[PDB]
Scaffold this active site. Structure first.
Site, mmCIF file in Angstrom:
data_model
loop_
_atom_site.group_PDB
_atom_site.id
_atom_site.type_symbol
_atom_site.label_atom_id
_atom_site.label_comp_id
_atom_site.label_asym_id
_atom_site.label_seq_id
_atom_site.Cartn_x
_atom_site.Cartn_y
_atom_site.Cartn_z
ATOM 1 N N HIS A 157 21.192 6.102 -8.649
ATOM 2 C CA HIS A 157 19.840 5.647 -8.944
ATOM 3 C C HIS A 157 19.006 6.735 -9.633
ATOM 4 O O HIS A 157 18.412 6.485 -10.692
ATOM 5 C CB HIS A 157 19.139 5.225 -7.642
ATOM 6 C CG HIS A 157 17.782 4.640 -7.855
ATOM 7 N ND1 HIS A 157 17.578 3.285 -8.010
ATOM 8 C CD2 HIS A 157 16.566 5.222 -7.977
ATOM 9 C CE1 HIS A 157 16.289 3.058 -8.199
ATOM 10 N NE2 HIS A 157 15.657 4.216 -8.193
ATOM 11 N N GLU A 158 18.938 7.920 -9.021
ATOM 12 C CA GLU A 158 18.157 9.017 -9.595
ATOM 13 C C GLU A 158 18.662 9.456 -10.962
ATOM 14 O O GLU A 158 17.855 9.729 -11.854
ATOM 15 C CB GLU A 158 18.106 10.230 -8.645
ATOM 16 C CG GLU A 158 17.370 9.971 -7.343
ATOM 17 C CD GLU A 158 16.038 9.250 -7.525
ATOM 18 O OE1 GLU A 158 15.380 9.433 -8.557
ATOM 19 O OE2 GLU A 158 15.638 8.498 -6.611
ATOM 20 N N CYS A 175 4.375 13.641 -7.221
ATOM 21 C CA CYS A 175 3.260 13.198 -8.061
ATOM 22 C C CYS A 175 3.193 11.708 -8.311
ATOM 23 O O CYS A 175 2.128 11.194 -8.661
ATOM 24 C CB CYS A 175 3.281 13.908 -9.401
ATOM 25 S SG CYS A 175 2.788 15.609 -9.297
ATOM 26 N N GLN A 176 4.324 11.022 -8.170
ATOM 27 C CA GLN A 176 4.375 9.601 -8.477
ATOM 28 C C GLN A 176 3.669 8.889 -7.327
ATOM 29 O O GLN A 176 3.919 9.220 -6.170
ATOM 30 C CB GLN A 176 5.832 9.113 -8.670
ATOM 31 C CG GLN A 176 5.961 7.889 -9.601
ATOM 32 C CD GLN A 176 7.365 7.259 -9.640
ATOM 33 O OE1 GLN A 176 8.092 7.269 -8.655
ATOM 34 N NE2 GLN A 176 7.731 6.693 -10.789
ATOM 35 N N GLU A 224 11.877 0.536 -12.305
ATOM 36 C CA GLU A 224 12.745 0.340 -11.140
ATOM 37 C C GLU A 224 13.874 -0.666 -11.292
ATOM 38 O O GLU A 224 14.996 -0.405 -10.833
ATOM 39 C CB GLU A 224 11.922 0.060 -9.874
ATOM 40 C CG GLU A 224 10.964 1.172 -9.536
ATOM 41 C CD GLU A 224 11.612 2.550 -9.552
ATOM 42 O OE1 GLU A 224 12.813 2.676 -9.214
ATOM 43 O OE2 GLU A 224 10.937 3.520 -9.914
ATOM 44 N N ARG A 257 11.059 9.921 5.804
ATOM 45 C CA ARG A 257 11.340 8.972 4.727
ATOM 46 C C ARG A 257 10.629 7.661 5.068
ATOM 47 O O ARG A 257 10.980 6.982 6.039
ATOM 48 C CB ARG A 257 12.860 8.784 4.543
ATOM 49 C CG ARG A 257 13.277 7.974 3.304
ATOM 50 C CD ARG A 257 14.796 7.877 3.276
ATOM 51 N NE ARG A 257 15.301 7.014 2.219
ATOM 52 C CZ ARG A 257 16.595 6.782 1.985
ATOM 53 N NH1 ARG A 257 17.540 7.355 2.729
ATOM 54 N NH2 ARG A 257 16.944 5.961 1.002
ATOM 55 N N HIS A 314 17.611 7.019 -13.697
ATOM 56 C CA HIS A 314 16.250 7.272 -14.172
ATOM 57 C C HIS A 314 16.162 8.199 -15.385
ATOM 58 O O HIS A 314 15.158 8.165 -16.101
ATOM 59 C CB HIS A 314 15.373 7.833 -13.062
ATOM 60 C CG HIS A 314 14.688 6.784 -12.240
ATOM 61 N ND1 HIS A 314 13.955 5.754 -12.796
ATOM 62 C CD2 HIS A 314 14.609 6.620 -10.898
ATOM 63 C CE1 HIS A 314 13.459 5.000 -11.833
ATOM 64 N NE2 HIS A 314 13.840 5.506 -10.673
ATOM 65 N N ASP A 349 0.238 3.440 -3.798
ATOM 66 C CA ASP A 349 0.978 3.788 -2.594
ATOM 67 C C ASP A 349 0.937 2.667 -1.574
ATOM 68 O O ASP A 349 1.877 2.491 -0.800
ATOM 69 C CB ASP A 349 0.434 5.072 -1.958
ATOM 70 C CG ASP A 349 0.682 6.307 -2.810
ATOM 71 O OD1 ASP A 349 1.574 6.280 -3.709
ATOM 72 O OD2 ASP A 349 -0.026 7.313 -2.563
ATOM 73 N N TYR A 391 10.507 9.896 0.205
ATOM 74 C CA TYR A 391 11.393 8.912 -0.448
ATOM 75 C C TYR A 391 12.860 9.326 -0.455
ATOM 76 O O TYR A 391 13.185 10.494 -0.250
ATOM 77 C CB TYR A 391 10.932 8.626 -1.878
ATOM 78 C CG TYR A 391 9.489 8.179 -1.999
ATOM 79 C CD1 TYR A 391 9.113 6.866 -1.690
ATOM 80 C CD2 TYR A 391 8.503 9.062 -2.410
ATOM 81 C CE1 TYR A 391 7.780 6.455 -1.788
ATOM 82 C CE2 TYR A 391 7.175 8.662 -2.514
ATOM 83 C CZ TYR A 391 6.829 7.357 -2.216
ATOM 84 O OH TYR A 391 5.528 6.964 -2.327
ATOM 85 N N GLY A 392 13.745 8.360 -0.688
ATOM 86 C CA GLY A 392 15.164 8.631 -0.793
ATOM 87 C C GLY A 392 15.417 9.641 -1.892
ATOM 88 O O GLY A 392 16.212 10.598 -1.732
ATOM 89 N N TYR A 432 11.813 -3.208 -7.453
ATOM 90 C CA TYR A 432 13.234 -2.865 -7.424
ATOM 91 C C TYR A 432 14.107 -4.118 -7.488
ATOM 92 O O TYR A 432 14.901 -4.287 -8.421
ATOM 93 C CB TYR A 432 13.586 -2.088 -6.137
ATOM 94 C CG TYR A 432 12.962 -0.712 -6.026
ATOM 95 C CD1 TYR A 432 11.644 -0.553 -5.580
ATOM 96 C CD2 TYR A 432 13.690 0.426 -6.358
ATOM 97 C CE1 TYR A 432 11.049 0.725 -5.481
ATOM 98 C CE2 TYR A 432 13.112 1.703 -6.257
ATOM 99 C CZ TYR A 432 11.790 1.842 -5.822
ATOM 100 O OH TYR A 432 11.232 3.098 -5.718
ATOM 101 N N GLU A 456 13.070 11.112 -9.270
ATOM 102 C CA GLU A 456 13.782 11.459 -10.515
ATOM 103 C C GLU A 456 13.117 12.567 -11.376
ATOM 104 O O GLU A 456 12.964 12.436 -12.616
ATOM 105 C CB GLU A 456 13.995 10.192 -11.345
ATOM 106 C CG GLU A 456 12.705 9.592 -11.957
ATOM 107 C CD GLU A 456 11.953 8.595 -11.063
ATOM 108 O OE1 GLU A 456 12.108 8.621 -9.832
ATOM 109 O OE2 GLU A 456 11.207 7.759 -11.611
HETATM 110 N N1 3IP Z 1 3.190 0.314 -6.070
HETATM 111 C C1 3IP Z 1 3.539 -0.521 -7.075
HETATM 112 N N2 3IP Z 1 3.704 -1.841 -6.817
HETATM 113 C C2 3IP Z 1 4.050 -2.730 -7.756
HETATM 114 C C3 3IP Z 1 4.257 -2.298 -9.051
HETATM 115 C C4 3IP Z 1 4.088 -0.950 -9.338
HETATM 116 C C5 3IP Z 1 3.730 -0.027 -8.360
HETATM 117 O O1 3IP Z 1 3.598 1.320 -8.682
HETATM 118 C C6 3IP Z 1 2.994 2.281 -7.794
HETATM 119 C C7 3IP Z 1 3.851 3.421 -7.251
HETATM 120 C C8 3IP Z 1 5.033 3.833 -7.863
HETATM 121 C C9 3IP Z 1 5.771 4.897 -7.321
HETATM 122 C C10 3IP Z 1 5.342 5.577 -6.180
HETATM 123 C C11 3IP Z 1 4.151 5.178 -5.578
HETATM 124 C C12 3IP Z 1 3.416 4.111 -6.108
HETATM 125 ZN ZN ZN Z 2 13.569 4.514 -8.757
#
Ligand code: 3IP
Ligand code: ZN
Ligand code: YB
Length: 606
Positions: free
Chosen positions: A292-293, A132-133, A315, A560, A296, A372, A264-265, A380, A268
């Site tokens: 890491h997870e 969902c993220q 992050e 990935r 979170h 995305d 993704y790796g 990060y 969380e």
């Molecule tokens: N994509 C991003 N770039 C900079 C700051 C914040 C952001 O959040 C978007 C995001 C987060 C997690 C998964 C997919 C997209």
């Molecule tokens: Zn993370």
């Protein structure tokens, strides 16, 4: 204001609870049912509200046992379509009602991947998983799809009876489905308030093995034994995380090992972290992803970014705790080694985007940007660089870890902005304000490119990696003979990876050098995905045609994005593999994860 959401903001109304009742239909690749949202008005005389949706079919909306009027707005690209609901009775401030929405998802849901039996390990059963993220929850159910809103949830999920359902919640039982005896209903409860991006589901032929007092590992049977071993540090890392962050509030900490197309790796999801099977190196060497997870569970899940503009808060703090956990496990010299590696990764990111690019800012503005598309290492590593620098400025890790614990405590169950973080930093370090006032806040937070100041890094573990890399880069043909298998003798897998990362930064190397590396080091034989990834990148970038099938295989056998995206990119940029790369993508495109398919497509300009 949350510029990624089309819903009524938190200042208007707040979702307090979701009860989800749905069935997973594998024949139609749809999720069908009802989302009953308990909504609290924040306003006087509230008569309507708007929810996010994306590719949902809405059957009806019911309040007080009667169907009410609603409307879906025009689709706004990756944001989906706003859903306005007409409330049958104006609400006063703090009044709560239940709005029950009948919906069905589309097979093309950007939140979901549906796999045929042949795409799984067992080859007998299909498999579903969510992701969902950042803003893909709207693609599963109607909601205020914004991390500025936190809610508890309950769920009952009807699935084919031979399959298992799991969610980011505590498992609350199972019974046969009274409406269909070929089915089971799995039940779930999440009593800690969460942002909806943390809602998660998997349905599949899942088995489990216990690996700690509060951790089961889940996967298809073919992966259970290996996962149990790979992730056995999990409890040790939890205890360390709890010591740094305060009590783990979520009850269980389970792991689910996904099929290879998980983008993704890790993810969380509360009570149930999702990880990639690319972590299964056989020696626990990729466990920083677990650290890491776990991290979170405090930074991200307890303290949450209010909008995706402040994702760095999620992050950067997580990576910072991550690195502390690994330093506790393996020593401060190792934390520094990994910290410096991350700075390396940031130079890469800033170089790729361009030093003036908006996505290289720590705090970004996501107005009209798909998250995305904007997603990268920047939040990060620039986030971490900021914290490590502040750590060094304010008196070292022991002092700054005092701040991190106070910070988590202070903002638990809340959603915050960069300014909230900085306000608290200044309050916490009140006696160190002059020193805090030396930081170039404007550059660190708002300027593009590498940070205005690089932190200080112990070099101990890094030197040998730099030294070997430099030998290869400066070597002429008559030096190739001197290279030998024993060069690697005292390097850990981490150092092998750093050596390759160092060398990759100066790629291409001459083709003959790269052939020699294979001859003396046999990197083709390494299964560690991080190492194999960087090695195949170096080979393709150095124009080794032999590597083309190896790169194509790795790019497609797992999904990935970290690995799949730059491998397709490298293959597209190599003229000898350009056609095959495009062809391969086109062929796999329909059976890929929808987000991955989308991004690799843009990446390849196809
Ligand atoms: N994509 C991003 N770039 C900079 C700051 C914040 C952001 O959040 C978007 C995001 C987060 C997690 C998964 C997919 C997209
Ligand atoms: Zn993370
Ligand atoms: Yb020479």
């Amino acid at each position: 204001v949350d510029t990624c959401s089309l819903a009524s903001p938190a200042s208007v109304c707040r979702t307090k609870h979701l009860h989800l009742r749905c069935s997973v239909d594998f024949t139609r690749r749809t999720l069908t049912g009802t989302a009953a949202l308990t909504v609290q008005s924040q306003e006087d005389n509230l008569r309507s509200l708007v929810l996010d949706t994306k590719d949902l079919t809405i059957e009806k909306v019911v309040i007080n046992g009667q169907e009410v009027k609603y409307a879906l707005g025009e689709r706004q690209s990756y944001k989906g379509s706003p859903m306005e609901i007409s409330l049958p009775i104006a609400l006063s401030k703090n009044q709560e009602i239940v709005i029950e929405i009948s919906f069905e998802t589309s097979p093309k849901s950007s939140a979901l991947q549906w796999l045929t039996p042949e795409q799984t390990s067992g080859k007998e059963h299909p498999y579903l998983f969510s992701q969902c993220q950042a803003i893909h929850c709207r693609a599963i159910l109607p909601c205020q799809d914004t991390p500025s809103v936190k809610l508890t949830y309950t769920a009952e999920v009807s699935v084919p009876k031979e399959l298992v359902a799991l969610m980011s919640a505590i498992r609350d039982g199972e019974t046969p489905d009274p409406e269909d005896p070929s089915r089971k209903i799995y039940k779930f409860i999440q009593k800690v308030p969460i942002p909806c991006y943390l809602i998660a589901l998997v349905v599949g032929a899942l088995e489990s093995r216990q690996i700690g007092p509060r951790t089961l590992v889940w996967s298809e049977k073919e992966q259970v034994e290996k996962s149990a071993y790979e992730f056995s540090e999990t409890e040790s890392m939890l205890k360390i995380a709890e010591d740094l962050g305060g009590p783990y509030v979520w009850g269980q900490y389970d792991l689910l090992v996904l099929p290879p197309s998980f983008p993704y790796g890790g993810m969380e999801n509360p009570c149930l972290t999702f990880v990639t099977p690319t972590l299964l190196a056989g020696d626990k060497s990729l466990s920083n992803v677990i650290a890491h997870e776990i991290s979170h569970s405090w930074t991200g899940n307890l303290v949450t970014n209010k909008t995706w503009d402040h994702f760095w808060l999620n992050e950067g703090h997580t990576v910072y705790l991550e690195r502390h956990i690994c330093g506790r496990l393996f020593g401060e010299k190792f934390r520094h080694f990994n910290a410096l590696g991350g700075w390396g990764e940031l130079q890469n990111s800033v170089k790729t985007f361009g030093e003036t690019h908006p996505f290289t800012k720590l705090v970004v503005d996501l107005t009209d940007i798909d998250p995305d598309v904007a997603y990268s290492s920047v939040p990060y590593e620039k986030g971490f660089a900021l914290l490590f620098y502040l750590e060094q400025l304010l008196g070292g890790p022991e002092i700054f870890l005092g701040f991190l614990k106070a910070y988590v405590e202070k903002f638990s169950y809340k959603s915050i902005t960069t300014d909230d973080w900085k306000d608290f930093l200044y309050s916490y370090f009140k006696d160190k304000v002059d020193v805090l006032n030396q930081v170039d806040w404007n550059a660190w937070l708002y300027s593009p490119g590498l940070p205005p100041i690089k932190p200080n890094y112990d070099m101990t573990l890094t030197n040998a990696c730099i030294a070997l890399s430099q030998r290869w880069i400066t070597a002429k043909e008559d030096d190739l003979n001197s290279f030998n298998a024993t060069d690697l003798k005292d390097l850990s897998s981490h150092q092998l990876n750093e050596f390759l990362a160092q060398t990759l930064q100066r790629a291409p190397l001459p083709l003959g050098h790269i052939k020699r590396m294979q001859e003396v080091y046999n990197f083709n034989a390494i299964n560690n995905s991080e190492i194999r990834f960087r090695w195949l990148r170096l080979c393709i970038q150095s124009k080794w045609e032999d590597a083309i099938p190896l790169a194509l295989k790795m790019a497609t056998e797992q999904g990935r994005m970290k690995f799949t995206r730059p491998l397709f990119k490298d293959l597209a940029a190599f003229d000898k593999s350009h056609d095959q790369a495009v062809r391969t993508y086109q062929e796999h495109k329909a059976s890929m994860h929808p987000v991955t398919a989308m991004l690799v497509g843009k990446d390849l300009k196809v």
